[PDB]
């Protein structure tokens, strides 16, 4: 059927690698590439056509207890393993990574409506906001 | 609130370029890392607590008419300037992309509740399949 119309997702990506490297990427891109799968949405009207596809990755599960030491394998950010600790202070939840780099760690804590998260390395901060779907 | 479940969608991310950067996140990760948007879903009780967070970010926005020649920015993979020229033969979109690469288009067409996408490049072929959701 001529008919495309609807969202698509992704279930199988055979030889990207390949065609990816024919397009000149390089393979530091075509290595993260590989591991996000499409989604697809197709507006057809008649023979006019508009398609959008996003990309996603998985980037990782973290399960702890707060007050229990635990190892974190930091895959989606720089592959290192540090020794995480997540305590309370009031309603901020608070986590020291110790290990390789100093003055690591993160805090998260809610504000009405919005989910706050402040990631700390060294003198950088990086601050991200979320809100509900 | 202590209370942190929910789906968080990522509305706002500062300075996560300095903060990969104090990490050591090398530049062909950093540079897709700063345009992805994250959605984080916690399950937490009490102080028990599980984080899975995934990320996405924006590949192309393609708005065609069948027939008719259009100019095509390749941002999502290599970011070349080509004349793509979608026909029908059947029920399958033909696309031939006329530019620097030799041998460059795509098909696309539906069977059943799936649709595919054949991607080819010189000798390279990519076969991508999608389920419609
Ligand atoms: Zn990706």
Redesign the pocket.
Known sequence: TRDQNGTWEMESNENFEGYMKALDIDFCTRK??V??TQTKVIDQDGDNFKDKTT???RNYDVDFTVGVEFDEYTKSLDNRHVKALVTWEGDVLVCVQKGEKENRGWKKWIEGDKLYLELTCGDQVCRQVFKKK
């Open positions: 993260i590439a591991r996000c990309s996603t990755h």
